[PDB]
Amino acid sequence: LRNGESDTKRNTQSQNEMNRTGLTKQYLIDNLQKLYSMRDTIFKTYDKECFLHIW
Amino acid sequence: LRNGESDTKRNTQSQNEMNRTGLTKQYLIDNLQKLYSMRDTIFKTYDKECFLHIW
């Protein structure tokens, strides 16, 4: 006559960490056309208000 | 004559936790044009409702 007994305890602890980055640049001609007058638009507001307008 | 018996009890308790964080930064040239009148229109409503409009 043979008897027995068993017992187990498995305990796992884990940690993860993921750092994903990216950078996508799209070149379109439509952006160059809109680029043209960004700087010039600054001084249209200066000229309209601050300066004289008759020769 | 051989007789056998066998028992087993398992009990697994698990816990997860997942924290995600993202920051997608988009550069559109259109959003730069809309920057212009953002501060100026603050003082166009001041002018119309508080100051004299005749010289």
- DSSP state letter for A51: S
Largest CA distance in chain A: 122
A37 and B31 Cβ atoms separated by less than 8 Å: no
The whole-angstrom distance between A55's CA and the closest CA on chain B is: 22
Q: What are phi and psi of B2, to 5 degrees?
A: -130, 125
Looking at the complex, report in whole angstroms how far the Cα of residue B8 sits from the nearest Cα belonging to chain A.
9
| Residue whose tokens read 């993202």 | B22
d(CA A28, CA A25): 10
Cα separation, B46 vs B55, whole angstroms = 17
* Contact criterion met (CB < 8 Å) for A34 and B33: yes
Min Cα distance B16 → chain A (Å) is 10
**Closest Cβ opposite residue A31 in set B29, B36, B40:** B29
What residues in A contact B40, CB-CB < 8 Å? 45
| Rounded CA separation A5/B8 (Å) | 10
Give the nearest chain A residue to B10 (CA atoms).
Answer: A8
| Cα–Cα distance measured from residue B23 to residue A38, given in angstroms and rounded to the nearest whole number | 28
